[PDB]
């Protein structure tokens, strides 16, 4: 049994942790068997240390992170548009996919799989 | 091989045809043995009549259908937010799921997710 109130409410531990740049926080929310996989990126990557990784990548810069919608949580999955803003050499870039959480009856999430392509980065010059 | 400008060509006709109530047009978007699923309903139909079927009942009363954000697309998969409104006994009411396609190699949908709660109906009294 996994609530649409906890579902959305792993989602915004997840954005607001990402914005913290808070790794522990981020990973506690996964099952230790969980994966992780960006669309068109590489294969995905499984298991506490792996998705750790995965993530402290994301961070090298600060992250202003946003839930652009309303979570949709339904049953034991959540999926959610948002955007992830961060600045490099002067140019600012917002990038905005939608990702898609399935839990367990524990109500850790077993998957993650993030959806964005070059339409969804928004960046000047 | 499928380009992000066809899988999201693909979403707006899709989304074109949910307005137009045109059936014949939804279910050409799907490959023959696809599979519709909606996450809090019941269990995936699959192929082409179970297609059809289900999209009938969706169209009972006519819908305005409109992508609410730009649609994510990469490798052969794509996300996308949006609104269904429909009129019934004088209330209006806005359902806002966020549905995935993956799309095989012909370009077609093999399958097709819908994830929407109650928290993602919004209906006045």
Do not use: C, W
């Amino acid at each position: 049994m996994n609530t649409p109130e906890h579902m959305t409410a792993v989602v915004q531990r997840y954005v607001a942790a990402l914005n913290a740049g808070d790794l522990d926080g981020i990973v506690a929310l996964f099952a230790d068997d969980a994966t992780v996989e960006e669309g068109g990126g590489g294969e995905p990557r499984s298991g506490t240390a792996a998705i750790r990784e995965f993530y402290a990548n994301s961070l090298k810069l600060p992250l202003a992170v946003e839930l652009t919608q309303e979570v949709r949580a339904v049953a034991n999955e959540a999926a959610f548009a948002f955007t992830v803003s961060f600045e490099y050499q002067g140019r600012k870039t917002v990038v905005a996919p939608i990702d898609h959480f399935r839990f367990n009856g524990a109500g850790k999430v077993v998957s993650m799989r993030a959806l964005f392509g070059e339409k969804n980065i928004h960046a000047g010059a």
